Structure formats: C-alpha cells, structure tokens
Design a protein around this ligand. Structure first.
Ligand code: HEM
Ligand SMILES: O=C(Nc1cc(C(F)(F)F)ccc1-n1ccnc1)N(Cc1cccc(O)c1)c1ccccc1Cl
Length: 460
C-alpha cells in the first residue's frame, strides 16, 4: 500500500508485505521465531510492517545504545501505542514525552536501593508463607504446577508492597484484592483483539469513546475506590509503595488519579512477570541438578542453618545471580524493545524517518550464535566473574536499557532471589513424568511455556 514502499526506498531488506496486513501472517510461528528467522535471512538490519505501521529491527550494539540511551530524550522517547488505555494513559509505562519525564522523576526515589532494603523484611515474610504452602503440596506425592505457587507468592508480595494488605492468596482466594488482581494477566498481542487493532489502528480512537478499556474496567474502578478509601484510612511509613507516593505528594505534583494509575501498573508489571520467570528458573534447575546442587550449597554457605535472607546477603550470593541472569538470557519475557522515532534522524550512518517504530529483538540477540556459544544449552557459567565482562550490555537486555529501562529491576531481582533462597533451602525439585523434557514455547504473544511446568517436590 501507500505506506508499504518505505523500506524499499531506503534499501532495507525484509519480507514482502501483503496489502492491509503487512507481515502479520508471519506471526504464525510467534514473535520469537519470526525475529530469529529474519535475523538469519537478512543480517543485522531489516524491516517489516505491522499492518500499515513500518517497523525497523536493529542489532548493532552501537545503534541500540544510540536509540536506548544517547538519543533517547530527543528522538526515541516513547513506545508504540497498544490500544484503548482510558484513564490509564497517565501510567508511567504508557505516558509520553514531557509527562513521562515528570512521572519518572516523581517515582524514581520509590525504587532506590535504600527503600528496597527497607522492603526486604516484608517480602521475606511471604517467603515463609510460600514454604508452608509448598510443603503441603510436597506431601501430596504428586507434581505441582509452579505458576500457581509462584503466582500466589507474587500476589502476596505485591499486595504487601503496593498496600498494607497482608494476605495468603493460595488459601484465601476471596479477599477483593485477590479476586480482582488475579485478572491482571499479560497481554497476548497476537490474539484476535490485538491483531485486529494493529491492522486497524483507526479503531483505537473509536474504542475509547465507547469507554472500552484494555484493562478490565471492573478491577480498575474497584482498585481506584480502595486506594481512595485507604488514603483516608491512613489520613508509620511501613515502606509502602502507596505511602511513598502519598508522602511525596506533599517538576510538578502527582495527582490522585495519577497515583492510582501508577499503583495498578506496579501490580500489573510484577504479578505474571515475577511468577513466569520464577517458573522458568525452577524448570532449568530440575533438568540441571548440578546447578541446583551448587546453588543449594551456596545458599547454605552464605545463610547457614536455614538463616533468613538479607539485602546484604542476597547481593552477596554470586551463583544465584548467575542462575537468574542465564534464565533471563534464554527467556527474556519481553522478547522485544520498541521505540517510536518522533523526528527525522540519522544514527550510525542510517536514516530513520519519522513515525517508524525501531525494534530491538531481545530474544533473537540472546540466542545468536555470534555472541553466545551453545546458546540453547543453559550454561550458567556465561556470567562468571571473569566471563561477565565479555557480554555486551546492549545485546543482553532483559530489563531494557537507557533512561526508560525497567524501573523495578532491583525490586524484581530482589523479590525473585528472596523467593529462590527460601524455597531451595527447604526443598529439592525433581523432574516428574508430567514435565516436558524439551519445554516447547508458546506460539502466541507471550513468552510462556506451551504446557504449564509441573515438577516433583521433595523435602530436605
Ligand atoms: C522479572 C520481572 C521483570 C522483567 C523481566 C521486566 C522487564 C522490563 C522491560 C524489558 C521493560 C522495558 C524497558 C525498555 O523499554 O527498555 C520494563 C519496563 C518497566 N518495568 Fe519492568 N520488568 C519486570 C518487573 C517489573 C516490576 C515488578 C515492576 C514494578 C515496579 C516493573 C516496572 C516497570 C516499569 C514502571 C516500566 C516502564 C519504565 C518506563 O516506561 O519509564 N517491572 N520492564
Ligand atoms: O512494557 C512492558 N510491560 C508492561 C506493560 C504495561 C502496560 F501495557 F499496561 F502499559 C504495564 C506494565 C508492564 N511491565 C511488566 C513488567 N515490567 C513492566 N514490557 C516491555 C515492552 C513491551 C512492548 C514494547 C516495548 O517497547 C517494551 C514487558 C516486560 C516483561 C514482560 C512482557 C512485557 Cl510486554
């Protein structure tokens, strides 16, 4: 069509698009397979169309640094709009340009290492809860699906960190927080709805005037009311995500609806993501028990006699840092990094026209043989103390990079590591007969396993 000749004029290789559809039919193998395929068949830079939207993929480390870090505030500042957002347009991950710079300033101190150290005791409290509910499942003599145990854990930390709500999600699935928040699963961008709106971006403004929100509106209105009630209910900082935005509420000021929007994004950002990575980590520990043994030995060394973890101790365990990093290399759940080019610009000898989405194939780079030897093998020694300097930080980007990287990286890493320390110091995980030995990945818009990971759990 009239927008499909762009990459031909610039002389950029890519699959030939179809009218009205672009290359979305090539998504039948999934985002990951499509990205790795184009990397093999086109080299270091290629292009394709999500409907009428042109997308340029870049793999040069210098270009990635220019897009994500150097020319970030000037050119590559925002992400592609993804659908009808409603009042959630004020969320930090959805805000654009000056509003984003303001909100990120108003929210950066919330994710300081100092504030994270003050959050460790609260998160550790539900590590003991996870172990208690894990032992009962171990006594059943039957395999357990890790998504439910970790999802229960990830919910308990989120509620206790975002608010003061202490809950046992696995045993108390009735509290209004547990019910509504359990409907904040990740967005399958290859489903009929999202595939439709990428082909029909003109329908996004229509959906907004019908008050059709991409987030379930019942959960949003419930959460807005609960925050409005809790603000009066405390009208003892307790290292509370909501409180840290209330005391900071008194650049510019953070509004009440803005505060509500950020709180929901933190719940959304850390419920399935935390549980998914924790499930991937345990799968690789079962199929590679030598790693699990050394990790279980390192946990006992730093924290003897099943000692509770600490900010100073978690940041000390080196082999635990290797297991999370290598799992995030194999399974970067974002799969991709996107920036919208807001003006004509030339980067590293390449012309990027206005309006083109620049894409960085994190999954494709993480499994590229030109940077990783035996990429499919899960060798956690890639990040040893003497081999962790060879890795290019712009090829391995599990949390993104630049001033729009993950704002909750330290929390997520701490939260996951605190969970791993407590569970491996009491249990061992064995591959049962209901476990997929190859672990086929899903073909949709999510980086999740095809079948849920079920493993045998024994007590130590
Ligand atoms: C293991 C879990 C997580 C992973 C793998 C992850 C990864 C990412 C990635 C790749 C991005 C995009 C950065 C880019 O565009 O360059 C991002 C953005 C973001 N993440 Fe996470 N994330 C995780 C958990 C969390 C959690 C628990 C929070 C809660 C505070 C959080 C808050 C955010 C925010 C606020 C952004 C948007 C930053 C901005 O737009 O300025 N993330 N994350
Ligand atoms: O933005 C992402 N997630 C996200 C989205 C929302 C929102 F939609 F409601 F606004 C809210 C929270 C998060 N969230 C999850 C973990 N931390 C932040 N990404 C990366 C990404 C995706 C697409 C384009 C792009 O440039 C960057 C992500 C991260 C981990 C797993 C899966 C994803 Cl899709």
């Amino acid at each position: 069509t009239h927008s499909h000749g762009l990459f031909k004029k610039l002389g950029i290789p890519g699959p030939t698009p179809l009218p009205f559809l672009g290359n979305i039919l090539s998504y039948h193998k999934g985002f990951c397979m499509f990205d790795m395929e184009c990397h093999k068949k086109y080299g270091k830079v290629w292009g394709f169309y999500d409907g009428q939207q042109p997308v340029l993929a870049i793999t040069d480390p210098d270009m990635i640094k220019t897009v994500l870090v150097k020319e970030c505030y000037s050119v590559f500042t925002n992400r592609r709009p993804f659908g009808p957002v409603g009042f959630m347009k004020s969320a930090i991950s959805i805000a654009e340009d000056e509003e984003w710079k303001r909100l990120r300033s108003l929210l950066s101190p919330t994710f300081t290492s100092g504030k994270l150290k003050e959050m460790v005791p609260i998160i550790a409290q539900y590590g003991d809860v996870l172990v208690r509910n894990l032992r009962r499942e171990a006594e059943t003599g039957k395999p357990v699906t890790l998504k439910d145990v970790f999802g229960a854990y990830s919910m308990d930390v989120i509620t206790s960190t975002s608010f003061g709500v202490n809950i046992d999600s696995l045993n108390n699935p009735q509290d209004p927080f547990v019910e509504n928040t359990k409907k904040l699963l990740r967005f399958d961008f290859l489903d009929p709805f999202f595939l439709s709106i990428t082909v029909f971006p003109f329908l996004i403004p229509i959906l907004e005037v019908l008050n059709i929100c991409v987030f379930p509106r019942e959960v949003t209105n419930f959460l807005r009311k609960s925050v409005k009630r809790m603000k009066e209910s405390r009208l003892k900082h307790r290292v509370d995500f909501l409180q840290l935005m209330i005391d900071s509420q008194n650049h510019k000021a953070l509004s009440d609806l803005e505060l509500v929007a950020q709180s929901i994004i933190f719940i959304f950002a850390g419920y399935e993501t935390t549980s998914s990575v924790l499930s991937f980590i345990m799968y690789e520990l079962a199929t590679h028990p030598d790693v699990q043994q050394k990790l279980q030995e390192e946990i006992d060394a730093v924290l003897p006699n099943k000692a509770p973890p600490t900010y100073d101790t978690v940041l000390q365990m080196e082999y635990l840092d290797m297991v999370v990093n290598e799992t995030l290399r194999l399974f970067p759940i974002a799969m991709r990094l996107e920036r919208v080019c807001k003006k004509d610009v030339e980067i590293n000898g390449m012309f990027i026209p206005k309006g083109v989405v620049v894409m960085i194939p994190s999954y494709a780079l993480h499994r590229d043989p030109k940077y990783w030897t035996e990429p499919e093998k899960f060798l956690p020694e890639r990040f040893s103390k003497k081999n962790k300097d060879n890795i290019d930080p712009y090829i391995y980007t599990p949390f993104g990079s630049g001033p729009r990287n993950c704002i909750g990286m330290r929390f997520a890493l701490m939260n996951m590591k605190l969970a791993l320390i407590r569970v491996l110091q009491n249990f061992s995980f064995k591959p049962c007969k209901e476990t997929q030995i190859p672990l086929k990945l899903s073909l949709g818009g999510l980086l999740q396993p095809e079948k849920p990971v079920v493993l045998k759990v024994e007590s130590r």
